[PDB]
mmCIF file of C-alpha atoms and ligand atoms in Angstrom:
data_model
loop_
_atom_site.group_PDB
_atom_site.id
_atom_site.type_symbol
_atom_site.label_atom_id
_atom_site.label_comp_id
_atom_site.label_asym_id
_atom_site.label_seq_id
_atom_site.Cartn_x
_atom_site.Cartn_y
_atom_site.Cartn_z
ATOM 1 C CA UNK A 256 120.788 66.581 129.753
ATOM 2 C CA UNK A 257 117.078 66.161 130.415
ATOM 3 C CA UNK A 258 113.688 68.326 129.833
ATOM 4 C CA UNK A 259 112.647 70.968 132.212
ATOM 5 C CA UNK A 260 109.766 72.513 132.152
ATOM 6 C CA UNK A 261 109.786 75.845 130.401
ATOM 7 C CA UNK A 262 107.324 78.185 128.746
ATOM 8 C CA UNK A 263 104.253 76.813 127.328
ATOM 9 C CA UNK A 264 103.291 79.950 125.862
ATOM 10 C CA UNK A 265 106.280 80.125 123.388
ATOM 11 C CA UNK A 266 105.292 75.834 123.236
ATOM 12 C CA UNK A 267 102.421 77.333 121.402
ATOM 13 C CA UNK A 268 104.167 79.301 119.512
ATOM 14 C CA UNK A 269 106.590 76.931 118.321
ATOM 15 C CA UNK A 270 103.859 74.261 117.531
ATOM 16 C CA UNK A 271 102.161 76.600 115.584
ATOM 17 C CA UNK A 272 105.281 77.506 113.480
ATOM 18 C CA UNK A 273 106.874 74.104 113.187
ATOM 19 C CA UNK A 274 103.868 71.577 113.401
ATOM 20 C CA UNK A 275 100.912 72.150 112.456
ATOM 21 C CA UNK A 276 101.786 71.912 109.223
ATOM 22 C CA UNK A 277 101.650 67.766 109.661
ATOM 23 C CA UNK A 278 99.719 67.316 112.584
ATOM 24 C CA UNK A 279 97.026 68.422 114.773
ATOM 25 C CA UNK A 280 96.227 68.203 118.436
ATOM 26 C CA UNK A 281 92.942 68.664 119.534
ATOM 27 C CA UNK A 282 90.978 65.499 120.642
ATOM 28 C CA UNK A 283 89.142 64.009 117.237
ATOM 29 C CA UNK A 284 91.149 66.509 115.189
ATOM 30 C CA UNK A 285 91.960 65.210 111.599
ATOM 31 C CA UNK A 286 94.933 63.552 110.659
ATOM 32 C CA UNK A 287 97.314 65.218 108.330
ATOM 33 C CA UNK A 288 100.641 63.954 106.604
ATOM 34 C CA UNK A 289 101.407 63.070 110.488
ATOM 35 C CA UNK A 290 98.806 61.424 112.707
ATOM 36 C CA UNK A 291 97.074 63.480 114.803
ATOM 37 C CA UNK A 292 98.730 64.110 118.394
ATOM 38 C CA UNK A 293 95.750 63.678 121.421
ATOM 39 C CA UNK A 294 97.394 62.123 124.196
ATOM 40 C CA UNK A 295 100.119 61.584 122.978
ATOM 41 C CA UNK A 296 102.275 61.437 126.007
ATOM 42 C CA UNK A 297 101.491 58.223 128.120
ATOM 43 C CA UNK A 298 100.751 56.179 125.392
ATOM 44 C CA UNK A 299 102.987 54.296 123.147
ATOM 45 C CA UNK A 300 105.147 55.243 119.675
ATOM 46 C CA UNK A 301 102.997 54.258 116.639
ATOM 47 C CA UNK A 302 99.400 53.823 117.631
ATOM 48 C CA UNK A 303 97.206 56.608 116.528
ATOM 49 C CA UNK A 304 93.511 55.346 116.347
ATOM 50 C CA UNK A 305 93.350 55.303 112.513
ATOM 51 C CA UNK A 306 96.527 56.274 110.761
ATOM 52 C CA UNK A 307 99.022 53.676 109.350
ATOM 53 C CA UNK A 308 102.753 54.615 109.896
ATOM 54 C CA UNK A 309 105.868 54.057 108.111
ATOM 55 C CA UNK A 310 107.774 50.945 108.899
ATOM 56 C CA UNK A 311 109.187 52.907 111.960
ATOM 57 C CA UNK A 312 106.798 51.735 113.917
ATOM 58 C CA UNK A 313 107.834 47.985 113.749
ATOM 59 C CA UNK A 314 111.766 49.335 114.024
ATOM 60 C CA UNK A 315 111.379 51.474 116.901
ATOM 61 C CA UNK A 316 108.820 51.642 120.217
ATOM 62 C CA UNK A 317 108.731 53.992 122.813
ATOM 63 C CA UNK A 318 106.303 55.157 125.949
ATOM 64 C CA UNK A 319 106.530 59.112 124.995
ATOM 65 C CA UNK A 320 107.528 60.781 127.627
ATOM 66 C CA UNK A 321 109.028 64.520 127.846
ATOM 67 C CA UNK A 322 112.319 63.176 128.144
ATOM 68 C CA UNK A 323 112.028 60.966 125.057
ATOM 69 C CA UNK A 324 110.090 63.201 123.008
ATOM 70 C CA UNK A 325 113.201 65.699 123.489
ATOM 71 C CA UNK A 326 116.060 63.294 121.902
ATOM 72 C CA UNK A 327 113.168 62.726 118.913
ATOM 73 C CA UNK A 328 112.772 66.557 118.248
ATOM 74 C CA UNK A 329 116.490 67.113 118.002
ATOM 75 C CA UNK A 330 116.320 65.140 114.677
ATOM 76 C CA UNK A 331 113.110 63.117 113.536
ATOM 77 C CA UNK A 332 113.991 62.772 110.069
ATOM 78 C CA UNK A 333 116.314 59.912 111.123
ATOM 79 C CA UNK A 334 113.588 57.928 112.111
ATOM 80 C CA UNK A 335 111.996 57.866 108.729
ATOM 81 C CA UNK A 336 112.761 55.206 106.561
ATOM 82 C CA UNK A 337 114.758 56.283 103.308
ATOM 83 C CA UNK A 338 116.128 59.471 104.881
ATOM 84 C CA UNK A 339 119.986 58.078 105.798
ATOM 85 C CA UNK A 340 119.836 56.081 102.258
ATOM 86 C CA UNK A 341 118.765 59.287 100.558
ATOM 87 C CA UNK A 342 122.500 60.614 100.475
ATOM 88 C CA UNK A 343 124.497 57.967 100.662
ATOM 89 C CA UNK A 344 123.435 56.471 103.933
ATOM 90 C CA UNK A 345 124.834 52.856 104.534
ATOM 91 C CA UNK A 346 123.058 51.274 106.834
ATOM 92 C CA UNK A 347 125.608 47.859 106.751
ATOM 93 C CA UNK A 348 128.947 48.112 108.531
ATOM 94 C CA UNK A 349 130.131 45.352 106.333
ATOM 95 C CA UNK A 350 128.467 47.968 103.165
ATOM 96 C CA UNK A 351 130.549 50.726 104.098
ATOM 97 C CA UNK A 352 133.691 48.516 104.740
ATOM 98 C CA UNK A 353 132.976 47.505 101.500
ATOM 99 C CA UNK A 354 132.072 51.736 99.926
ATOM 100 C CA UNK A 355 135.774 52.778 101.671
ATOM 101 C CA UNK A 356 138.213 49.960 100.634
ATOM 102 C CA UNK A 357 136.707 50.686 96.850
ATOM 103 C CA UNK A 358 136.913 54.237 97.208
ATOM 104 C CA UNK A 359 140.527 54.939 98.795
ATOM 105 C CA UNK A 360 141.856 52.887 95.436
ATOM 106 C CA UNK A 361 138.828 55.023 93.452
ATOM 107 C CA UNK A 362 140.030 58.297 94.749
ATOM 108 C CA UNK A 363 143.596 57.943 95.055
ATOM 109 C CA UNK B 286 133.986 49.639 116.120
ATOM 110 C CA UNK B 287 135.835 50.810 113.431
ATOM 111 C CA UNK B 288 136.840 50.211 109.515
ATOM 112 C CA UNK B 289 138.488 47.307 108.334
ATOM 113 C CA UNK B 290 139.811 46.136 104.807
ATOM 114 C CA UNK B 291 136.842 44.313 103.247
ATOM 115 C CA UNK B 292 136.311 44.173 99.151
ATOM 116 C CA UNK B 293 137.248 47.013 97.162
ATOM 117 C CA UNK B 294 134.898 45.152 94.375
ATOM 118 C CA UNK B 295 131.555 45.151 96.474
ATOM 119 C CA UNK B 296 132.416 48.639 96.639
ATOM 120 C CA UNK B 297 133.256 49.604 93.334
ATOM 121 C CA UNK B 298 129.348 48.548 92.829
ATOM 122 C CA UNK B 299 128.341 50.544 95.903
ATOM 123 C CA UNK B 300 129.598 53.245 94.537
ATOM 124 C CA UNK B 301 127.810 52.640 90.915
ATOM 125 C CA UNK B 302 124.481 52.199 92.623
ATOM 126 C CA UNK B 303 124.725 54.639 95.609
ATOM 127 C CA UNK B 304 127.305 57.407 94.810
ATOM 128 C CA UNK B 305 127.464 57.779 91.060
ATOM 129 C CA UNK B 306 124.302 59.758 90.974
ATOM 130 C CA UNK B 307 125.773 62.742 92.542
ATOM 131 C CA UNK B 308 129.694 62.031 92.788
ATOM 132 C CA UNK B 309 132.581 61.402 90.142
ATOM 133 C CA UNK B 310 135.215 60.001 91.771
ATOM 134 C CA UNK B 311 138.144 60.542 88.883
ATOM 135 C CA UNK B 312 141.608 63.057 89.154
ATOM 136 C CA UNK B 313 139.122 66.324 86.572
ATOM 137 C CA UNK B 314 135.586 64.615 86.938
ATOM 138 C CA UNK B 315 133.303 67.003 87.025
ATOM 139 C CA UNK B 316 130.816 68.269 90.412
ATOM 140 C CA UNK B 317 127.526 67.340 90.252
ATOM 141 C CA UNK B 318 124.491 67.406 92.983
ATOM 142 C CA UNK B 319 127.752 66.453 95.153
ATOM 143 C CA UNK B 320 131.690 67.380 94.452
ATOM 144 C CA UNK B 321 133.721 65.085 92.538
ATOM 145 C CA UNK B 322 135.642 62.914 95.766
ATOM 146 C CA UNK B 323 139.248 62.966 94.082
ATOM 147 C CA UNK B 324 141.629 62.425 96.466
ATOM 148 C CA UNK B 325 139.185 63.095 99.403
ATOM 149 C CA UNK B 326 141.022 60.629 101.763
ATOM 150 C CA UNK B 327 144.044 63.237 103.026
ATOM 151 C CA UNK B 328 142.796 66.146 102.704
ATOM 152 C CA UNK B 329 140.015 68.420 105.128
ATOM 153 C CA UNK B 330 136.438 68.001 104.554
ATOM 154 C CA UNK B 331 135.052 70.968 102.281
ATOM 155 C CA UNK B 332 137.635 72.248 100.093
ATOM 156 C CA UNK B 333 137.450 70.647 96.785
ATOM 157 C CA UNK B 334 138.175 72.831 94.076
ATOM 158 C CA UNK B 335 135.347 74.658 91.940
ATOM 159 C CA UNK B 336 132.440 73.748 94.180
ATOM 160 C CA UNK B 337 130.742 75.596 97.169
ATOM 161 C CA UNK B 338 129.722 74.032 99.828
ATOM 162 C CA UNK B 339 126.453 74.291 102.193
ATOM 163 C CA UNK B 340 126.889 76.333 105.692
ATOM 164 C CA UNK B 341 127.598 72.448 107.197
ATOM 165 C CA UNK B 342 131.452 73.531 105.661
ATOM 166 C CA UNK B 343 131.531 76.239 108.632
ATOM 167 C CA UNK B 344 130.022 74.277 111.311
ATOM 168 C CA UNK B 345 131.680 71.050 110.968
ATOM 169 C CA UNK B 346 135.669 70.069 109.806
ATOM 170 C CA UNK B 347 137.141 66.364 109.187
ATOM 171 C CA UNK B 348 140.096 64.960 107.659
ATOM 172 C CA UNK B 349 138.869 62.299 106.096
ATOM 173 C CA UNK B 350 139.954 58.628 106.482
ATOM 174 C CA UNK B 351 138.719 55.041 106.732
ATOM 175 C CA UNK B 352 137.444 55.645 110.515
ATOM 176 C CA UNK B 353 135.505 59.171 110.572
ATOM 177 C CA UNK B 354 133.973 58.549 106.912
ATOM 178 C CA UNK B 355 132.534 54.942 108.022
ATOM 179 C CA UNK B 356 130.656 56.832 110.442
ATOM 180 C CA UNK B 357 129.798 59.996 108.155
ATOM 181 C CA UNK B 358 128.381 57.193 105.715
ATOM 182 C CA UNK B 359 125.597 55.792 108.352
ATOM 183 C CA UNK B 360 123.429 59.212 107.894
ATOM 184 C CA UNK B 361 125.228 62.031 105.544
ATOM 185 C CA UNK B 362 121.676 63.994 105.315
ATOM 186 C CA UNK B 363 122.123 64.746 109.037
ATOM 187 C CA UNK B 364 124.465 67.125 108.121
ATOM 188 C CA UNK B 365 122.621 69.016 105.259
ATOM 189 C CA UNK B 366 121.463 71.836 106.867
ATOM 190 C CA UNK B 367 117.524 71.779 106.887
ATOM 191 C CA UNK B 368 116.972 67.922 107.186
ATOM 192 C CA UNK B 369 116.766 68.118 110.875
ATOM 193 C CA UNK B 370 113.842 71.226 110.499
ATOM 194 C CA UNK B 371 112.123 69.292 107.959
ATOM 195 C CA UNK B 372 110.271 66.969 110.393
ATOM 196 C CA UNK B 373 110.142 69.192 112.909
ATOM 197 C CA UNK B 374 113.693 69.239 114.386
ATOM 198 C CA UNK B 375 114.152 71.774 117.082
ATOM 199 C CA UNK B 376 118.236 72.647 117.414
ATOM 200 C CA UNK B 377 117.960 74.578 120.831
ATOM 201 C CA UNK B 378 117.224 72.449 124.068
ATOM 202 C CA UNK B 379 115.290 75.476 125.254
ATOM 203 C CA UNK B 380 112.782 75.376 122.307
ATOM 204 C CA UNK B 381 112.328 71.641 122.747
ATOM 205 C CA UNK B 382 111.466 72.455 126.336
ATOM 206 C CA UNK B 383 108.791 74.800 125.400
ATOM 207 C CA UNK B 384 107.389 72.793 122.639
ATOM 208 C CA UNK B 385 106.670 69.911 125.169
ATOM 209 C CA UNK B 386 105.858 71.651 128.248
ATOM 210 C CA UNK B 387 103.210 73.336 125.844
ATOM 211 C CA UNK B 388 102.421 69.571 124.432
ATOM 212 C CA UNK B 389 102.062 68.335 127.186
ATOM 213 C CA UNK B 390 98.922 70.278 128.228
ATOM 214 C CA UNK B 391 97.138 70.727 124.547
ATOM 215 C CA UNK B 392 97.479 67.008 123.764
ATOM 216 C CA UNK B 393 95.959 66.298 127.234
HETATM 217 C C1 HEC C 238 106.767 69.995 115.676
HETATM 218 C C2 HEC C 238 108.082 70.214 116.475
HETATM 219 C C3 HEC C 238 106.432 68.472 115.571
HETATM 220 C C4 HEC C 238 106.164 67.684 116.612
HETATM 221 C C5 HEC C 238 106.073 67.980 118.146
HETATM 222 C C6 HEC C 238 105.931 66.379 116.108
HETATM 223 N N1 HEC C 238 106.050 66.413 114.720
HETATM 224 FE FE1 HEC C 238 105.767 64.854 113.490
HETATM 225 N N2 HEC C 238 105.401 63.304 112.277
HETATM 226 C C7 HEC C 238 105.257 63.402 110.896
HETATM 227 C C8 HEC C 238 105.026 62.076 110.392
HETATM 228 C C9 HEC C 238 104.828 61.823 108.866
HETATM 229 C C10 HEC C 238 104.992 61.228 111.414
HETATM 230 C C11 HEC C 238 104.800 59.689 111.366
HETATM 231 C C12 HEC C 238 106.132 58.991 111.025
HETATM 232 C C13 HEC C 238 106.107 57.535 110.605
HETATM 233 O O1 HEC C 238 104.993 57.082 110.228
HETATM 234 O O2 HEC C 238 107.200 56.900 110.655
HETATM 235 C C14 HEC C 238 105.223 61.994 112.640
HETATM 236 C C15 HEC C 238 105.286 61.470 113.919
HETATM 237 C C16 HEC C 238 105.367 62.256 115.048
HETATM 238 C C17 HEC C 238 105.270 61.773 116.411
HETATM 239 C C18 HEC C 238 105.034 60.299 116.784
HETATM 240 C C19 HEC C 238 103.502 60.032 116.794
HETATM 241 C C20 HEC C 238 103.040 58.709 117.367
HETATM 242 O O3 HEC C 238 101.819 58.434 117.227
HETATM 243 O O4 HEC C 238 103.918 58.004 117.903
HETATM 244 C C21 HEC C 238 105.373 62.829 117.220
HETATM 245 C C22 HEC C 238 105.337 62.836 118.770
HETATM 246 C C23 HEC C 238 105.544 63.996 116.404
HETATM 247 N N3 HEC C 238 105.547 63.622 115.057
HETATM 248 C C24 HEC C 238 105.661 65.287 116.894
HETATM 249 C C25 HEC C 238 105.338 64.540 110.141
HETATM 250 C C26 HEC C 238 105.718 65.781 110.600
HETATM 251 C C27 HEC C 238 105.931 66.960 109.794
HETATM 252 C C28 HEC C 238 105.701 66.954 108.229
HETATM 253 C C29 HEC C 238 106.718 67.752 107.404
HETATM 254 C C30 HEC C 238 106.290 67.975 110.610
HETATM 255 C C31 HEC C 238 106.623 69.455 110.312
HETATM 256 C C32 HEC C 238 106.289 67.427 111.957
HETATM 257 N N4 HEC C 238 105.945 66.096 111.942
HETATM 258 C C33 HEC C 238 106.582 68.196 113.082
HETATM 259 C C34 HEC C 238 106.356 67.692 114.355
HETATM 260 C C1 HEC C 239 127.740 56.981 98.246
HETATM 261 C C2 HEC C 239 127.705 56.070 99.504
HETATM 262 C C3 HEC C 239 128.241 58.415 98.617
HETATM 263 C C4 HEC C 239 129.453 58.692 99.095
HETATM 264 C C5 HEC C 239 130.687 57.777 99.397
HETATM 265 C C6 HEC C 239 129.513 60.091 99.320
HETATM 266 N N1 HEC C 239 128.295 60.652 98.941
HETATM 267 FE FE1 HEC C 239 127.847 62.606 98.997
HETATM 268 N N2 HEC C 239 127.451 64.569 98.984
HETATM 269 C C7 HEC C 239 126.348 65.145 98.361
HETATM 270 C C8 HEC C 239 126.412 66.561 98.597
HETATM 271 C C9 HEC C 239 125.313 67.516 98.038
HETATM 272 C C10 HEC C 239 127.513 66.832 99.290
HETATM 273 C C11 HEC C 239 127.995 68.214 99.805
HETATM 274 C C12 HEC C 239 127.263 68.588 101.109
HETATM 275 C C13 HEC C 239 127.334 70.019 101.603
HETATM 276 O O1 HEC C 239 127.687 70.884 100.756
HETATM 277 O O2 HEC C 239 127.023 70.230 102.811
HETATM 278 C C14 HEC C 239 128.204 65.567 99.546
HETATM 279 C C15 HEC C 239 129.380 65.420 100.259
HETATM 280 C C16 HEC C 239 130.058 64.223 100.350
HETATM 281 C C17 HEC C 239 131.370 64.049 100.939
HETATM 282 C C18 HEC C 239 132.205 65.199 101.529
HETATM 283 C C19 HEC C 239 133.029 65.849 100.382
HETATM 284 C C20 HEC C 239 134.098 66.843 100.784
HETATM 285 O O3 HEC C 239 134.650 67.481 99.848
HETATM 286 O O4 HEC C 239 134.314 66.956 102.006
HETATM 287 C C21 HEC C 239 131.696 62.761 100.820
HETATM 288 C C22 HEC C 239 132.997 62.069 101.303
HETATM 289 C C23 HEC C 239 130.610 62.088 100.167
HETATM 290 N N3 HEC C 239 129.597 63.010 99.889
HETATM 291 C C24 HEC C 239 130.600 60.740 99.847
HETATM 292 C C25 HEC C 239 125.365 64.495 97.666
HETATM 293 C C26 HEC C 239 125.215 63.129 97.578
HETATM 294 C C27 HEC C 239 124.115 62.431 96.956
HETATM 295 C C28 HEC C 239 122.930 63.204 96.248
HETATM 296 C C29 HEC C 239 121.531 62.612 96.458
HETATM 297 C C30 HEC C 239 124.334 61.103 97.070
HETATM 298 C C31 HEC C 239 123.512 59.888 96.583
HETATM 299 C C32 HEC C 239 125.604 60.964 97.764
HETATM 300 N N4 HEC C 239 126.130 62.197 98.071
HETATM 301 C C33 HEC C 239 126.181 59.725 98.037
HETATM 302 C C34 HEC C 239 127.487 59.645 98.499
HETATM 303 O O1 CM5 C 240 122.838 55.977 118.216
HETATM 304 C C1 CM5 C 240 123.472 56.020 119.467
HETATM 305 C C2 CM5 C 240 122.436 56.179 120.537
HETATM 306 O O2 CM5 C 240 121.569 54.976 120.536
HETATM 307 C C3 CM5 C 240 120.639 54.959 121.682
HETATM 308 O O3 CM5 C 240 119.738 55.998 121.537
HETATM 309 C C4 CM5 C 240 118.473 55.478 121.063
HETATM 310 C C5 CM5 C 240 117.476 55.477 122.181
HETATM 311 O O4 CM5 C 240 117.864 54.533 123.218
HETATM 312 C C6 CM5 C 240 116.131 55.085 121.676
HETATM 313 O O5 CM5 C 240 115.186 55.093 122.759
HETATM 314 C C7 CM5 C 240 115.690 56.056 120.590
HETATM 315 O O6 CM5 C 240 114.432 55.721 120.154
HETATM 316 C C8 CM5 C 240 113.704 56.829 119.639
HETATM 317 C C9 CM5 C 240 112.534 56.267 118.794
HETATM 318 C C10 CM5 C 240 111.599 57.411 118.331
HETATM 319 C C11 CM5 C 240 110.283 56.759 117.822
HETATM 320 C C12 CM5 C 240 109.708 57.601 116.647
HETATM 321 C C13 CM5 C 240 108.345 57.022 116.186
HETATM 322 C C14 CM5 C 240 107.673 58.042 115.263
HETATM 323 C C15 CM5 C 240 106.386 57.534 114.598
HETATM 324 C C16 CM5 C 240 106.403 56.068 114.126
HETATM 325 C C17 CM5 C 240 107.314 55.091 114.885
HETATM 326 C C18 CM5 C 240 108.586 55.694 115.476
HETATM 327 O O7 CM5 C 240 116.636 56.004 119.435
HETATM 328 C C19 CM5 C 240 118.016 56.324 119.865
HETATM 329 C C20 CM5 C 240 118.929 56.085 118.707
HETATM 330 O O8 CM5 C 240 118.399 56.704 117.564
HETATM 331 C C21 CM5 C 240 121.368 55.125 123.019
HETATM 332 O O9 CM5 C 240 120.396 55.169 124.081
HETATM 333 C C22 CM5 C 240 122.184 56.368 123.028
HETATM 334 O O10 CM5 C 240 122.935 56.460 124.281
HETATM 335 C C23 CM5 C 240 123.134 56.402 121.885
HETATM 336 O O11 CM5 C 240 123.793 57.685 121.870
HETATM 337 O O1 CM5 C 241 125.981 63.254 118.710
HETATM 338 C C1 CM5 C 241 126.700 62.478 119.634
HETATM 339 C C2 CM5 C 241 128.044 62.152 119.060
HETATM 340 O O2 CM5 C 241 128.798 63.417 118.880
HETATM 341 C C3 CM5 C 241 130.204 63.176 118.498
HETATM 342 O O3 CM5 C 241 130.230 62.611 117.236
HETATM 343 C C4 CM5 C 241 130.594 63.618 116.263
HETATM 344 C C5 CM5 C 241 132.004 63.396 115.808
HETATM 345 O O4 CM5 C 241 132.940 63.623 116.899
HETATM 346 C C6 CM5 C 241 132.347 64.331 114.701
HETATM 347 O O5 CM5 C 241 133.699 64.101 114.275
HETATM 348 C C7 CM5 C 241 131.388 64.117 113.538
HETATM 349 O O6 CM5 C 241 131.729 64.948 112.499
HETATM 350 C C8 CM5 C 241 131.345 64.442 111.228
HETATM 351 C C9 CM5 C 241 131.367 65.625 110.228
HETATM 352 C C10 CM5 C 241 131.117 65.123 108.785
HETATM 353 C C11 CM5 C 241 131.513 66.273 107.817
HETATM 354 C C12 CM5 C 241 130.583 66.246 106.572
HETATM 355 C C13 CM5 C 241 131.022 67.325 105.547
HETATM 356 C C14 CM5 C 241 130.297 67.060 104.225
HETATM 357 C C15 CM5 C 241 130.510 68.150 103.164
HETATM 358 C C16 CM5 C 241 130.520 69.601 103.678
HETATM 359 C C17 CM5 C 241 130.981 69.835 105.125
HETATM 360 C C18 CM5 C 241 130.688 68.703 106.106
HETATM 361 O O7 CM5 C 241 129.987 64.416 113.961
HETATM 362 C C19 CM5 C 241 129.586 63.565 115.105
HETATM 363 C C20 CM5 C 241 128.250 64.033 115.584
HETATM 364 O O8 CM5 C 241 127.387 64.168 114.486
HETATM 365 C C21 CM5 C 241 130.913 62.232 119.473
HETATM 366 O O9 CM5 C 241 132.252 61.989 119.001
HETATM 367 C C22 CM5 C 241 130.179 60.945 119.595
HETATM 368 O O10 CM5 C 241 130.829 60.094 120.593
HETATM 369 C C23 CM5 C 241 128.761 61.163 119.987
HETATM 370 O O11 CM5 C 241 128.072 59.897 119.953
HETATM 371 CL CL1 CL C 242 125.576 45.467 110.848
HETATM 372 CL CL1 CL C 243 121.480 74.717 123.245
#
């Protein structure tokens, strides 16, 4: 399903437990490992005045929205390059075609 | 779509370059970072002998073949518990809602 709009009290909360850490949000507030977040929403994926992204940002575009930014926050380590290689991750059909056929023999 | 038959010798130097570091795939190999993957393809997800498992053992269950490992193989860190937190992943729909209603107004 979709976003609804809930409590933005525990918002605050949450931010403060799960993101601050990387980013901040206040207008001209610093960027930190992640790019600072002012107005955000409305503007497009990757664009932060003066912080250079990961090649994400030439993979992927969207216009944040709540909706979007709700399917990102289930998982955004996905998005960031080297995290599906890091354990295996095969990002060629053909590759793991390839992996399976060698490892049924492999295994067997 | 789904696996099909491609070269077991490709694979065999997947496997060298992309598994080896924290699989053995030979009947006694020993565990290492990962569980040694003799014969995985047959038997449930979870279960080989002399190695415990992460909590993803208790939440998740496959017998493994060609079909449900191809797919396992685009992005196996999804399942480690803590990869989703680790960039700010938010598990409950209600906790994304209150992140972003909250968001919403302090990135304004
Ligand atoms: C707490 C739940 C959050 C929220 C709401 C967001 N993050 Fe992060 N984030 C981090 C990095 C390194 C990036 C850039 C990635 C890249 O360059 O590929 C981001 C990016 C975002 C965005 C997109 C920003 C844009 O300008 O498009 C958004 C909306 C976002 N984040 C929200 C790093 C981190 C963390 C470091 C460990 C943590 C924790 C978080 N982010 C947590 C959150
Ligand atoms: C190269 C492409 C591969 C392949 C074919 C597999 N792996 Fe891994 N793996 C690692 C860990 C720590 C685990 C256990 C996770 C947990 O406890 O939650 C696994 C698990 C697997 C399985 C499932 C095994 C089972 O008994 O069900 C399979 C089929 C598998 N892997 C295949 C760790 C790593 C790595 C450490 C950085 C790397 C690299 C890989 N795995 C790569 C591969
Ligand atoms: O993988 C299967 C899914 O693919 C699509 O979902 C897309 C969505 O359509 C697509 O809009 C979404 O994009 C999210 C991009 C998030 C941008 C993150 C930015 C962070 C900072 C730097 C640049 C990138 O990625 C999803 C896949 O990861 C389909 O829409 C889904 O229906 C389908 O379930
Ligand atoms: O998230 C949306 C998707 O959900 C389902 O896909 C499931 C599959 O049905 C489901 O079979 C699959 O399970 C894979 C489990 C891999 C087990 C890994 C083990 C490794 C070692 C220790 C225990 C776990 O996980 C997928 C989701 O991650 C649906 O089937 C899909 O259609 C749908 O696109
Ligand atoms: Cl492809
Ligand atoms: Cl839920």
């Amino acid at each position: 399903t979709e976003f609804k709009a809930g409590s933005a009290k525990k918002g605050a909360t949450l931010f403060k437990t799960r993101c601050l850490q990387c980013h901040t949000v206040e207008k001209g507030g610093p960027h930190k490992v992640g790019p600072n977040l002012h107005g955000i929403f409305g503007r497009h994926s990757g664009q932060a005045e003066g912080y250079s992204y990961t090649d994400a940002n030439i993979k992927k575009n969207v216009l944040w929205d709540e909706n979007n930014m709700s399917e990102y926050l289930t998982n955004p380590a996905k998005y960031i390059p080297g995290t599906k290689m890091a354990f295996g991750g095969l990002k060629k059909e053909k590759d793991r075609n390839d992996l399976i056929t060698y490892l049924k023999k492999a295994s067997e």
